[PDB]
A and B are shown apart, each in its own frame.
Chain A
Amino acid sequence: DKTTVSGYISVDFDYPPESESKIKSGFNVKVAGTELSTKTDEKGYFEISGIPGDMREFTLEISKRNYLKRNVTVNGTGKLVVSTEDNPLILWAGDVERKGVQDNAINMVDVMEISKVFGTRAGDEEYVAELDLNMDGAINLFDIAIVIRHFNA
């Protein structure tokens, strides 16, 4: 008999209501030591089935571009629910991908990468779409504030 794990992932900063579906979706969730993975939907919901029933202890690897990656340990078998829509697992934005690579720390390095793209927009040479962290159509003080809020890993 196999194990199914589900839950909700979200963020802790303010954003425009129309970006909710884009902010909550696309978090990768993977069962460590397996190729069992999924992405969150528009409400931040994820589900992974077919975990071996004998695998009573596993780790969920949660990640997204520009977010501080997170390991959540789960103990149990059968139908498991690791978080709820009201108390979701929070991931912190601000571990900025730099030439394809994040360093698992939220730092002045991250702050400066945002500062680099401050005031940029689609079509600008330096514009990076996913550094508009709150997805409001601008890279400005609020995107910098999000990084500083989380100013350590």
Chain B
Amino acid sequence: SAHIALELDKTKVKVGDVIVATVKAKNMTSMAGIQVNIKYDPEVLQAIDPATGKPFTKETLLVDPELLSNREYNPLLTAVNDINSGIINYASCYVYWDSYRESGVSESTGIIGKVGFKVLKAANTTVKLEETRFTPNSIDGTLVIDWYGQQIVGYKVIQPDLEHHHH
């Protein structure tokens, strides 16, 4: 029924290619916050802004968030990426849950955010939503809270295709 998905726009690549990764939510009823962890091989892929090419560093947020962006509910966005371990670690959370609940309307389906990946090396690799040191006791490195601050569980996590070198 519900899921968090990681999508790649391209999976068969040559060196110099830029892969766009998109994190999406589906049927995530009452969601007021989310944390996602994207694990990649930093030797093979470089995390970049998919429009400017600027490399991600520790504080860099996922680009173009759709869900959890209502100004009236006081969105709190943060990232503590570990670029050397190849981890993107992003969290976004509303602070005014009472205003959000009163609306009755759930940010259940839409884009969490995006990150690009520049291909550095001609090698088969994987980009996955995956538990890291940032996210113990998680759902495949995803943490979701509802508008009462309780963990949302029971959803699936959808992984993109493994990445292959164009030979």
Interface members, chain A 132-153 (any B CB < 8 Å): 136-138, 140-142, 144-146, 148-149, 151
- Give the docked Cα–Cα distance between A143 and B93 (Å): 12
Q: Could you say which of B10-18, B39-47, B144-152 contacts chain A?
A: B144-152
Which residues from chain A contact B145 at a C-beta distance below 8 Å?
141-142, 145
* Residue A60, interface by CB 8 Å: no
Interface Cβ pair total, 8 Å cutoff: 55
Q: Give the B-binding residues of A (Cβ under 8 A).
A: 14, 16, 108, 111, 115, 118-121, 136-138, 140-142, 144-146, 148-149, 151
> In the complex, A148→B73 CA distance in Å?
12
Known contacts being A148-B149, A149-B148, A149-B149, is A141 close to B93, with CB within 8 Å?
yes
For A136, the chain B residues whose CB sits under 8 A away are 136-137
The minimal Cβ–Cβ distance linking B104 to chain A, given in whole angstroms, is 20
User: Judging by beta carbons under 8 Å apart, are A118 and B149 in contact?
Assistant: no
Q: Tell me whether A138 and B135 are in contact in the complex, defined as CB-CB below 8 angstroms, given that A115-B76, A118-B80 are known contacts.
A: yes
The listed residue with most B CB atoms (<10 A of its CB), out of A118, A121, A145, A151, is A145
> Least Cβ distance of A125 to chain B in Å?
13
| Other-chain contact of B93, A119, A120, A148 (Cβ < 8 Å) | A148
* In-complex Cβ contact of B95 among A121, A141, A151 (8 A): A151
Contact B76 A144 (CB under 8 A): yes
B residues near A144, Cβ cutoff 8 Å: 33, 76, 91, 93
Report whether A111 and B149 are in contact in the complex, using a CB–CB cutoff of 8 Å.
no
